[PDB]
Design a protein around this ligand. Structure first.
Ligand code: HDD
Ligand code: HDD
Ligand code: HDD
Lengths: 726, 726, 308, 83
């Protein structure tokens, strides 16, 4: 027995805040969290406790420490079948990673609609407010490999597998409402341009290189999503604090056959929140797994990520009433023109057991729709339908990928397909064809109907010649980037300018920079001049005379496009760093932890070493991490309680901890003699907005601090940070 | 509803003789035949009746007759995900075939020992006469593809998967007691030589071509198994009527650690029986699926194939007592020197449900042993141990092939292996490594012991230098071919001579034939001269003075090596053709069928067309096949009842039916005016042995016939067939 | 030296009638027969005479008869990399066979048009009577596996790969002018019906079983091709003595953008000739490789298959 | 076999030897080399046994393992000297 007698090796099977316990597989951490999909996976789950170590053939292994050899110092013998099996499996562990979105993090949950949508869709999972549909959701980046970092500047993926009673429905979206390109034929072109360059495979997880901006400068259709990626949208605080969109216009079909155009939205319950770039870039080095960890730990804490599903709904006769083409995925539908209507809510409440088996092997594909839903002629969606079935043949080893447990439907599935690599199902049907008499033609077709019917495509009208040709209605590239730009706050605009500037500064060929600046001058001259200034470029008089693009159906801004314009913050699930000293004033800490617990805010107690310290009243305080081990990048605010401040007053890591949080605009709270730290951040004796300070942490100290946290960051501090050396 | 109203599309779920019902998947034909492995497969068995036709994602299909197109005479649309999923799966149905033994047929069954064997082995499946071990057995040829024919001249494989309580044990044997080569390094060379030649991929399923006999002429070690292949052993009547051998010497390990050398035998309860060459070769054309079909139909009729397992046992101190090396797999152990001792019996009593899922995907490997068994230094076996693990990585798509359902153990298996393509099992173990504290080191090693202990290799002494070198004790090539030859009956010897003669006639390069004849002269000069005469070769004076090889430890012959020297014929399961006419004598047919049923001999009623005829007493007789439809190749004897014999007397197909069966030495019985047919086979009025004849089928008629059948063929007829034009 | 002293191991590199000589690889049997595609393959052709035996890494092997073992009656050692490379490659020799048409026989050749088809198509390989196009042609059955027999009763495939100056053009046809089914959605249903039945994988290379005729009775569209299958068209004397058809209506596009509907045909120079059924069925037993053999040997005789 | 798709990974250009390589191995996924040898086995007479084995020697000779002495029982055991 190698476990410790005190049993401290096993985490408790109950919700615990991040860092209190070792993380564990979901069925062990929360065995009583169940749904119909989790239960169906029990047949393939494998335990371990009280079992013998065997080969894959069931043979008990006596000595798992040594190869078989001719003498204890002799050659290894080919007849060691236990070695060779163990090494063979190891030698073939890896499978191809996803072509795009290879880096991702996933969890189980459930979905439930608010009310029956049977008036607009016959889709069964939206027909009754009491119908609960299990889900599996994978969040992702786009460009980086499976081993790349979480907090890069990138688009994020948001893929939801609905295990419906009438088929698997995959909603395969991103965290922005549009994509970079218009036609699927260009997808390898765009992806090759953004991916690491083919001679040397640099850089990983970054669009800040020549070939990406080269493609953008020559393809202005890309400009809208590029705007989004250069904003703080491209660097989310977590997957819980981002939006989701299906991007394409789809169709809803009701029992009477009426089609309604629809676009899908996920609204985060935790609000919209993003990092700032210096923080996001450094965090890819201090913790490349930050988003993966934060997701797992929130679920282990009970901080279940929640999202409200919503629809923008457009009648068929309104197809042409907007300036933009509904079928153009580089165009958004402003919520000011078509509101998002609440449909239901999704809760992610259990982690997987084995990342490889459940996350890496999961297969999402937007062609996986159910009766009540249908496609449109969006030329990007159209080509997606081919790719997501095709790519699985190599990634997941063949055509039986639906038999891998995480991908199996929970509803019945029967047909006349047979064979293929690693076929699990053993068909007893006398027939493998239809029409057949020898099994009385079963399984049988089902006619279309209002529920439990067969799938039939909406009989939309088609008219035109066979052409490789872009619809002229698509050939407008600058109005929607402008609408986005004007909808941002001034500090969000600053960050957009700084994103473009930082990225173009790493383009080596200067003529590429100049061509991207010229495209910006077609969007907004304020934006283009600000970027040009940082690049040492001067706009020509002709460029200064570029007429701006028209408004979007009269709109000159839409505050739903901004992260922060309308407050939607939420402190539940946020984390505060508490910086300890060797004789902490316990009255401060008790007030701090009481206020944080009331709002569901977590705390990390940090010191210069691990182990424990003792407060003034003798209370023993366990240390979560060092100052260097858990930098301010990983928390939302910093609190410094009173006590023996001289212990850390001249500690470089303690001082830098506050300087980093200050530069990154986070709230900071100083109690008693901890107010001496204002000098390291150059805060005058009069104080300033964003620095909570008082004689002690009792009173309004923590309400000021929690109000600041509900506002996410202290945007008013931005003029002051450029003098801070951090 | 497409099935007929009389319900005649569905086979009866009861035992029925061959031809009486349509064949069916095992679980529908015999739902009440069960064992633990069959039951454990119910989780992956898929039904069909009363289920909707769906996609693999569970979506119900409305129209499975048409692609989705723009207009009903327009182009097919990329958005048809139902089409593309169906075609994709079809497009990827095939997996690589087995490098060797690609043609095979398999069945489920069970094994049971006669008594406890714990004095000599601690193997759990041999420990208790009431311990029942499920099995899955695949019989195979060697050379041809999965699409090649059954009744070729080849070696047969005989692979048994024992689903043991202490792990999978695969006994992977052949139907002869030796192999062609000594060291596994030569296996690709031998196999390439016997397989179709690389320029043009000819010939399929035949050793009768230049490169095979080239290798043989240059590799005398091959001569022993070549002798078996040229004998009638190479063309068995059924998989039920052949022997089985593990070939290599293995070890039995008992609980006190004593090692006993062992070779494995399967003795067929139905006795030993083979075809003749002209019959077997023509049958590869008339029914290339004859062995597969006969196996399947015997099981559906209740004629379960049965084999007795037996051990040749040799104490460790006797390793060097014999003239041959025990570890040399081209040498057999004569039963006259070391008898085969009975161990238990194996019954094959249910067919699979899906050939591809269960047969094609099954993975046998002789390195799959269990505690109580161990290997030896046999250099052919030693290399096999590498190959059967390695080949599955491409054939079965990766290292998780044990998770394919037919291959799964029925006992526990738990280890720290993870991932790999198609990974089914979801591991909940906090640890994927040992030693580990975080799961208190589970799953754990198990010390070896008398039962339920870990595997430990027998600590055999090893002494020598690292050499690529053949043991001198292996350098003897002719003694065992001679033993075999001399142990054969005169008619068996004639068939061997004609085997060699027919094959070498197909060798294009005459010098190869000459070199093979020189090798035979080192075996036996009677054999060598007979073959040479058929090839137009004249043995030189020196070849005539080649000294024959020595006896095998004083043994000059061993009747256990003959198919027929010791009678072991059994008639149950054999088939008789009955040649009808349009007014059969019903008293004859009544007595024929009553006697055949009394011994378990099946019958098929043949005529010049399908449908029915009526007998003289009004009885309606259903026709099973036409004369050409089911040739005499496919039956064991022929009976011609009395009646309107003129109806068929001048029918060429009916006359040829008898001539073919006569040429191939099968018994023929003729009643009443049927005796008129003696003219077509040139039998004199006073009859001859092997032709049953009487005024009616009454009396000793059917007893005479069944007596001939138990003797298999009428060997005395051989001198008469050479003048028969058939 | 293991060859006979009289050199009778080696076939002559000149045309010879069937059975006169051992068959041989084409570039050894007819090295003067060349086209642009055959010549472009010289970069990957591998010799053998006067070379040492090596591993795939180029290491010369001293003893290709024995595994490395601890003593000559000892266990085989894991460090024998020469064994494991040789057995590894052997162990992975097979690739999946074609889903349909798995059984087939192929040869090289060339094509040239009689006159310029410029008026009706701008296809380059049809623009100049002096323009030679290399081809590779595979003939096949449909139902049986790669190891099934040649003279079965089946449709035959007739696939031609044209290596034109403006791209590969594959003309993938059969020996009857129609097919069994109308819509590609039904192709796995039809193929599953004609193929060996799923429970026991019987019969090989035959449509003479329940599921095939079950489908046919329920799908009258199949009857036309079934009629060709049941005729002597289904058992050709040789690949040289059958027709070929593209089946589908395609289009020809000229330089003016005018489309012409076209159906493709191959007309055998040797004429149309078929076996009879009892003959064909017995021949799948006496020589299951009859058609592959006959094509190879006709070419070695200089008796080249030709099709218009 | 899984990482590079099969046993012909030596034919991927970066992995190819620059020296001659010839043996009797054939086929496998994505086979590039087109073998003209009449024989795919040895010993063979039909190509006069080419390509042929080479005895070990001072230069350009075949590979032979150093004939080190081996002495001991078949054991799964760490040498005490490693402890
Ligand atoms: C025609 C090609 C193509 C195009 C135009 C798109 N995608 Fe895609 N996408 C793929 C081809 C693809 C893929 C290559 O098929 C992936 C990679 C691995 C996979 O299974 O699917 C994939 C993966 C993938 C994933 C990750 C799913 C997972 O977690 O496994 C997401 C979230 C998206 N895509 C979302 C989108 C969105 C929102 C698009 C624009 C509207 C989009 N893709 C356009
Ligand atoms: C070192 C290579 C090697 C050598 C020397 C042998 N075999 Fe083998 N055998 C294989 C390598 C192999 C293989 C390539 O690994 C196969 C083909 C596909 C497979 O799964 O195993 C196989 C298949 C195979 C099968 C078919 C199993 C099934 O039905 O799936 C049988 C019955 C045998 N072998 C029996 C033998 C016997 C009785 C041998 C001589 C004693 C023998 N093999 C030598
Ligand atoms: C939608 C599926 C489908 C349909 C409707 C057809 N085929 Fe096909 N065919 C295939 C799917 C396929 C395939 C599965 O893609 C094959 C098997 C493996 C391959 O490479 O192509 C093939 C092989 C194949 C070959 C073998 C090529 C070779 O020698 O390698 C020929 C000659 C044909 N087909 C001809 C036809 C003809 C004349 C058809 C009717 C007009 C036809 N096929 C319908």
């Amino acid at each position: 027995s190698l476990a410790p007698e005190d049993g401290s090796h096993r985490p408790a099977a109950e919700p615990t805040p991040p860092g209190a316990q070792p993380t564990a597989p979901g069925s062990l951490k929360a065995p009583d969290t169940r749904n119909e999909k989790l239960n169906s996976l029990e047949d393939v789950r494998k335990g371990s406790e009280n079992y013998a170590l065997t080969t894959n053939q069931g043979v008990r292994i006596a000595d798992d420490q040594n190869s078989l050899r001719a003498g204890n110092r002799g050659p290894t013998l080919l007849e060691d079948f236990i070695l060779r099996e163990k090494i063979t499996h190891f030698d073939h562990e890896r499978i191809p990673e996803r072509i795009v979105h290879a880096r991702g993090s996933a969890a189980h949950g459930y979905f439930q609609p608010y009310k029956s949508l049977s008036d607009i869709t016959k889709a069964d999972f939206l027909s009754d407010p009491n119908k609960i549909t299990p889900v599996f959701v994978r969040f992702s980046t786009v460009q980086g490999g499976a081993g790349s970092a979480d907090t890069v500047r990138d688009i994020r993926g948001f893929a939801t597998k609905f295990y419906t009673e009438e088929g698997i429905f995959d909603l395969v979206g991103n965290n922005t409402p549009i994509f970079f390109i218009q036609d699927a034929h260009k997808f390898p072109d765009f992806v090759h341009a953004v991916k690491p360059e083919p001679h040397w495979a640099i850089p990983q997880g970054q669009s800040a290189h020549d070939t990406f901006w080269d493609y953008v400068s020559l393809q202005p259709e890309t400009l809208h999503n590029v705007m989004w990626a250069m904003s703080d949208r491209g660097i989310p605080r977590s997957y819980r604090t981002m939006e989701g969109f299906g991007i394409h216009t789809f169709r809803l079909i009701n029992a009477e056959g009426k089609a309604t155009f629809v676009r899908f939205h996920w609204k985060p319950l935790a609000g919209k929140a993003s990092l700032v770039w210096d923080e996001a870039q450094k965090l890819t080095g201090r913790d490349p797994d930050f988003h993966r960890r934060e997701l797992w730990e929130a679920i282990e804490a009970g901080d279940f990520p929640e999202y409200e599903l919503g629809f923008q709904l457009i009648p068929e006769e309104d197809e042409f009433k907007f300036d933009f083409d509904l079928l153009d995925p580089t165009k958004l539908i402003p919520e000011e023109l078509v509101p998002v209507q609440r449909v239901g809510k999704m809760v992610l409440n259990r982690n997987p057991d084995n990342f490889f088996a459940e996350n890496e092997q999961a297969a999402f594909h937007p062609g996986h729709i159910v009766p009540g839903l249908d496609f449109t002629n969006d030329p990007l969606l159209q080509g997606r339908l081919f790719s997501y079935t095709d790519t699985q043949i190599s990634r997941l080893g063949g055509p039986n990928f639906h038999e891998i447990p995480i991908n199996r439907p929970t509803c019945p599935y029967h047909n006349f397909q047979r064979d293929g690599m690693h076929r699990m199902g053993i068909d007893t049907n006398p027939a493998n064809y239809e029409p057949n008499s020898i099994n009385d033609n079963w399984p049988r077709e089902t006619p279309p109907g209002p529920k439990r019917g067969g799938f039939e495509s909406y009989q939309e009208r088609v008219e035109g010649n066979k052409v490789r040709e872009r619809s002229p209605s698509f050939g407008e590239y600058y109005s929607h980037p402008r609408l986005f730009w004007l909808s941002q706050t001034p500090f969000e605009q600053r960050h957009i300018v700084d994103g473009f500037s930082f990225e173009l500064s790493k383009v080596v060929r200067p003529y590429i920079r100049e061509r991207v600046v010229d495209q910006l001058a077609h969007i907004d001259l304020t934006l283009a001049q600000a970027v040009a200034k940082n690049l040492g470029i001067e706009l020509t008089d002709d460029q200064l005379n570029i007429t701006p693009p028209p408004d979007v159906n009269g709109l000159k801004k839409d505050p739903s496009l901004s992260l922060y314009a309308i407050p939607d913050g939420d402190v539940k699930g946020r984390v505060v760093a508490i910086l300890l000293n060797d004789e902490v004033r316990s009255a401060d800490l008790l007030a701090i932890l009481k206020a944080l617990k009331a709002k569901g805010v977590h705390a990390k107690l940090l010191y210069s070493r691990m182990g424990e310290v003792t407060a003034d009243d003798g209370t023993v305080l366990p240390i979560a991490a060092t100052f260097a081990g858990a930098p301010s990048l990983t928390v939302d605010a910093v609190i410094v309680p009173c006590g023996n401040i001289a212990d850390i007053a001249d500690n470089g890591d303690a001082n830098y901890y506050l300087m980093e949080a200050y530069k990154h605009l986070k709230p900071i709270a100083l109690a008693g003699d901890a107010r001496k730290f204002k000098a390291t951040i150059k805060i005058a004796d009069q104080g300033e907005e964003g620095i909570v300070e008082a004689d002690s942490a009792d009173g309004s100290f923590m309400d000021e601090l929690l109000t600041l946290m509900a506002a996410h960051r202290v945007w008013s501090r931005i003029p002051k940070i450029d003098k801070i050396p951090a």
